[PDB]
Design a protein around this ligand. Structure first.
Ligand code: 9RF
Ligand code: B7G
Length: 266
């Protein structure tokens, strides 16, 4: 079915183009200083963070605690908005919308963080990360300087992102990769596992064909990406352990209810 899969792919790419605020194409043009007549405002210390908050780049956040917790809250806000986009992306996939509504929630529940860290790589380079829909750039050094434990959260995502970005995927590749992360039969408590497994396999087959066409000189790209899916599960496991520790030890720190639900029983 060499051409049913091409149509399938184009539909998933269109769902992606329609629902994600930041594409990798856009992200990389910003990060190489070739997108606007003004660069992103660089946040690298307390003073620039404060300037960014005074309308320079940017509220409904919880009551201010301190700098490390403030950044933690902004990470939560960003995560909530990316979860919203991922849900619309998934719903824009017909095979997803026909599943048990409770299976839809199960797939999102166990898939969004894997997808988030995959997409994170698109707005990351070795020196920092885009924020505020590209209008700011927060430095990796600044994040390293936060108070423990908050300074340990993000550093592992940088390590993953730089290796992942070496594969030089584009948005059409990423649309299928994310779709495969969400439509995953290994997720606990699925009601119709064979139905999800068949969609997953269709997506992976589409992805394999897409890569042959899109990257014809890349050797072993498909099995490399499967390994990255495995790596993303470990990355999320470690992230969840750090979140657990923050919930245990940082009891002044507020936790968004949607995100607390996602982590409940993992
Ligand atoms: C704690 C946490 C981290 C991540 S890493 C991806 C990132 N997202 N936003 C980030 C950010 C936004 C703004 C700034 C500022 F500009 F303020 F400095 C700095 C960083 S970094 C993902 C989820 C997380 O916790 C929610 C969860 O686990 O659901
Ligand atoms: C973004 C803030 C979200 C706060 C989440 C911190 C606590 O989550 C807990 O993490 C465990 C997985 O490691 C689950 O097994 C627990 O049921 C759940 O309560």
């Amino acid at each position: 079915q060499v051409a049913d899969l091409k149509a399938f792919s184009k539909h998933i790419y269109n769902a992606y183009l329609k629902n994600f605020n930041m594409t990798k194409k856009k992200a990389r043009s910003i990060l190489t200083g070739k997108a606007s007549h003004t660069a992103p405002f660089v946040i690298h210390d307390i003073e620039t963070l404060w300037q960014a908050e005074k309308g320079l780049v940017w509220n409904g956040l919880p009551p201010y605690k301190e700098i490390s917790v403030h950044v933690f809250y902004r990470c939560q806000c960003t995560t909530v908005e990316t979860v919203r986009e991922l849900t619309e992306f998934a719903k824009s996939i017909p095979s997803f919308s026909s599943l048990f509504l409770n299976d839809q929630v199960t797939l999102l529940k166990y898939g969004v963080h894997e997808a988030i860290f995959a997409m994170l790589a698109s707005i990351v380079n070795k020196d920092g990360l885009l924020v505020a829909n590209g209008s700011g750039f927060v430095t990796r050094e600044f994040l390293r300087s936060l108070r423990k434990p908050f300074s340990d959260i993000i550093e592992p995502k940088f390590e993953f992102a730089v290796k992942f970005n070496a594969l030089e995927l584009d948005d059409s590749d990423l649309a299928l990769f994310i779709a495969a992360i969400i439509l995953c039969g290994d997720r606990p408590g699925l009601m119709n596992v064979p139905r999800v497994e068949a969609i997953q396999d269709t997506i992976l087959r589409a992805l394999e064909f897409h890569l042959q066409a899109n990257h014809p000189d890349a050797q072993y790209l498909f099995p490399k990406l499967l390994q990255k899916m495995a790596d993303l599960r470990q990355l999320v496991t470690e992230h969840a352990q750090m979140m657990q520790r923050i919930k245990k030890t940082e009891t002044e720190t507020s936790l968004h209810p949607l995100l607390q639900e996602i982590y409940k029983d993992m």
